[PDB]
Design a protein around this ligand. Structure first.
Ligand SMILES: [Ca+2]
Length: 318
């Protein structure tokens, strides 16, 4: 009725502004509306199938040490790699995984409370992680950590070499039916370049690769589209001294007004979302997958009638 009419007026007006400000810093280069609400799920229930081994803290500590990634390793790269790993492995809210090359692992989240698409409740989300490559050792194993909250999502390691992990994402309704979230906008944020350890190499790169949807570049952002539908910065977005617009600490948070500077938006185009999380020389890499897009002036799509401790904990660990 009147509420929807008012929402429609405001929504179409916002699209006209987004059109007008297309090229302005922080705005979407092509105007869109947001129909996906997948923002925060601190009460999600995480489960992993028994065919997958969820490692204990000390069990994985010992395993990673057996690979040479140890605080008593004389090699500074290896001992530094351990230090980063140890910080994430010591958090009891993450499921601890050793991914094997080309062996998919599902992480299921049920009991979702706050999430929806186009007015329809999202009850379950399933992530599928598949290690594709890593520069570490024989290239067949790497550690990752799955958050209790599916919008905080994952940390992965590269032990200051490189890692490429494929991710599938599938969303389900209250009746367990697969939902097609085509048109929904997702936040590929915090894609740092030049934010590495100075001892090893400053030019660490975090990226999204092989995205099966369509990127919407944010105007003014360091994140550009590349070959194999990949998104990353071409030079440092970490240090003003190497040409970055802001230093990392001035943009790279979930609440910063400049956080668009290291972000791009993804438009979903399929029921099974697919992308690859890729890093080099970063040690620890937080990859959050959610609808909390960093672009300015994106209205919520109206539906016509017929804060978070897991985020805080991850931010502190950065
Ligand atoms: Ca980051």
């Amino acid at each position: 009725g009147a509420k929807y009419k008012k929402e429609f007026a405001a929504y179409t007006a916002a699209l006209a502004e987004a059109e007008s400000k297309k090229k302005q810093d922080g705005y979407l280069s092509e105007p869109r509306s947001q129909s996906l609400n997948f923002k925060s799920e601190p009460n999600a229930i995480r489960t992993i199938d028994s065919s997958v081994h969820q490692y204990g803290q000390q069990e994985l500590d010992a395993l990673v040490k057996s690979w040479g990634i140890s605080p008593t390793n004389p090699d500074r790269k290896k001992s530094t790699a351990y230090s980063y790993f140890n910080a994430i492995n010591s958090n009891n809210t993450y499921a601890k995984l050793v991914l094997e090359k080309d062996k998919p692992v599902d992480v299921t989240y049920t009991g979702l409370k706050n999430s929806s698409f186009n007015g329809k409740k999202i009850s379950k989300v399933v992530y599928t992680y598949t290690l594709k490559e890593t520069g570490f050792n024989d290239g067949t194993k790497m550690t990752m950590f799955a958050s209790s909250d599916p919008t905080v999502t994952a940390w992965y390691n590269d032990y200051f070499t490189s890692t490429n992990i494929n991710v599938k994402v599938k969303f389900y309704d209250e009746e367990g039916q697969l939902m097609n979230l085509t048109g929904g906008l997702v936040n590929f944020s915090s894609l740092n370049r030049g934010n590495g350890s100075g001892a090893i190499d400053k030019d660490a790169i975090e990226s999204v690769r092989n995205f099966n949807g369509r990127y919407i570049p944010i105007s003014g952002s360091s994140i550009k589209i590349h070959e194999n539908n990949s998104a990353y910065a071409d030079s440092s977005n970490a240090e003003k001294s190497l040409g970055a617009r802001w230093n990392t600490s001035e943009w790279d948070t979930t609440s910063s007004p400049n956080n668009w500077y290291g972000a791009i938006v993804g438009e979903i185009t399929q029921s099974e979302i697919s992308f690859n999380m890729a890093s080099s020389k970063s040690g620890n890499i937080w990859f959050a997958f959610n609808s909390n897009i960093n672009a300015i002036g994106v209205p919520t799509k109206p539906v016509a009638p017929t804060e978070n401790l897991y985020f805080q904990g991850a931010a502190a660990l950065e």
